[PDB]
Amino acid sequence: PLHPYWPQHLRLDNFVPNDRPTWHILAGLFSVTGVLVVTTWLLSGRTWRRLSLCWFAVCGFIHLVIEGWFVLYYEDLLGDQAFLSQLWKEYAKGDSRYILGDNFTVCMETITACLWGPLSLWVVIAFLRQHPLRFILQLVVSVGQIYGDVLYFLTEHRDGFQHGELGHPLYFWFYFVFMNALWLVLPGVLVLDAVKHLTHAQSTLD
Amino acid sequence: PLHPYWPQHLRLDNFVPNDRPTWHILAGLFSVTGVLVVTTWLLSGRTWRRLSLCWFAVCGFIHLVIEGWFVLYYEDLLGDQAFLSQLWKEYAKGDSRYILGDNFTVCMETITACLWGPLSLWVVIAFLRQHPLRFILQLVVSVGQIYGDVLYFLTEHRDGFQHGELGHPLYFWFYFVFMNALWLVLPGVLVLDAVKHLTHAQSTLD
Ligand SMILES: CC/C(=C(\c1ccccc1)c1ccc(OCCN(C)C)cc1)c1ccccc1
Ligand SMILES: CC/C(=C(\c1ccccc1)c1ccc(OCCN(C)C)cc1)c1ccccc1
């Protein structure tokens, strides 16, 4: 093999093995995500719901900087730019096909980065008890995230898990299954939350 | 050409020209859709929302019966089955690729048939008792439909409108653009409705 991308018949010229090791990307972003969680917990102070605000901040970050970075540079994917493009190449060492510039994958990433990022930051802004749209926004964003993620899983699945080595501990179970499963589980609860409160908002209107 | 499907280099074996003309299916759908609109206007009476409710009923039909027929009986492509198969073959004479069994198209149709249909029926049925989940469900359904439709357009666009003859009056501008623009515009207005109502329902809690 001349490259890790696992549909092994892929003829990927113009491929450059990343200079920075995988632990560079994983650790540097875990660190920046912690920084955002702390900064947003403080700005919230200025219990669980105050955590959900940091969740929505980390969302807006991933959707805008990272998932948006893919939306722009899904054609180059050569490590001469910032380590974000290398991040995406490493995620592609995981299951999916973010190297080939998949028709569907580009579209779903474009939508989540254009809408759910801004709207997630609008959730964290409008949740400081300032606007009635706080749970409507939570509901819309989390429903959209659930849709995007379920379509991502279904599409890659109906391809028979073609892209990416099946069962791989690092690349399949963590990169593919776990990271994405977050935007399946966490916003699901949030939908229920946004539903359980908005139903109450509908009941008190009497 | 041995088929109208416009990526004309498509070699489509095991293809059977529909026995029933197009007017068969057109009338068979006109009658039943009118029947549903009438029965639901009656059950609503027994102002505007009584129309929107039958809209949510007609949705429940198309998503469940028609789009469900597609989700099941691809890729047989035999007009010897019910007039649903001829319906889908005629729509595929239009732009999109409901002949090829497109990965994304099948996945999106699976989600809209499994989720948005039932949920639209839950809106129209549970909208009779003024239940508090009604504007939440209306919002969720219409947001999901908008997501499905935006991805439906975007993917074909990044495919360069490959499937289907561009600009064709019947097949592209009516079948492709208009029919989907329906589920882009009408549930958009419904999103706005449910949002302004839930904002008012959220404002009163003080
Ligand atoms: C720990 C680094 C990381 C990653 C990452 C995970 C594995 C390998 C490489 C990178 C990340 C990247 C994209 C992502 O969205 C994938 C799209 N699917 C959801 C559809 C979710 C997580 C990350 C970056 C910022 C905040 C939190 C995590
Ligand atoms: C005019 C009768 C019709 C049809 C139809 C359209 C073109 C040719 C033949 C039949 C229909 C069929 C499928 C459909 O789903 C397409 C949207 N998805 C791709 C998102 C939307 C409309 C129809 C269906 C339900 C209610 C009212 C009319």
Side-chain angles (χ1 to χ4, degrees), chain B residues 157-179:
Chain B
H157 157 80
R158 276 204 72 268
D159 263 340
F161 300 66
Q162 184 187 350
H163 328 106
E165 185 178 7
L166 241 187
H168 197 300
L170 215 176
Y171 305 151
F172 169 61
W173 282 103
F174 175 58
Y175 284 169
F176 186 85
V177 183
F178 187 65
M179 294 313 289

Side-chain angles (χ1 to χ4, degrees), chain A residues 74 101-104 106-108 111-112 116 132-136 139-140 143-144 147-148 150-151 154-155 158-159 195 198-205, chain B residues 74 101-104 106-108 110-112 116 132-133 135-136 139-140 143-144 147-148 150-151 154-155 158-159 195 198-205:
Chain A
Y74 84 97
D102 200 53
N103 324 317
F104 158 79
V106 170
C107 292
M108 83 142 270
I111 292 184
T112 66
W116 306 145
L133 273 174
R134 54 193 175 267
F135 287 82
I136 307 169
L139 190 48
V140 172
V143 162
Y147 202 169
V150 171
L151 270 194
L154 266 179
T155 36
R158 274 205 70 267
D159 264 339
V195 159
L198 286 182
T199 45
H200 192 278
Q202 191 68 64
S203 294
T204 319
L205 189 131
Chain B
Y74 87 101
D102 200 304
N103 181 37
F104 159 79
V106 171
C107 297
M108 154 195 145
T110 287
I111 291 187
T112 65
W116 307 146
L133 274 167
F135 287 77
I136 304 170
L139 194 171
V140 166
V143 159
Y147 201 161
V150 170
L151 270 191
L154 265 178
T155 40
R158 276 204 72 268
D159 263 340
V195 158
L198 287 182
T199 48
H200 191 210
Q202 186 66 64
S203 295
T204 75
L205 281 65

Side-chain angles (χ1 to χ4, degrees), chain A residues 8 10 39 41 43 61 64 67 74 84-85 90 102 128 135 140-141 151 156 164 173 186-187 205:
Chain A
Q8 266 144 326
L10 284 166
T39 285
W41 189 346
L43 297 194
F61 174 50
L64 273 171
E67 289 185 23
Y74 84 97
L84 280 191
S85 210
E90 170 68 20
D102 200 53
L128 182 272
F135 287 82
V140 172
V141 179
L151 270 194
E156 208 301 321
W173 284 105
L186 302 195
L205 189 131

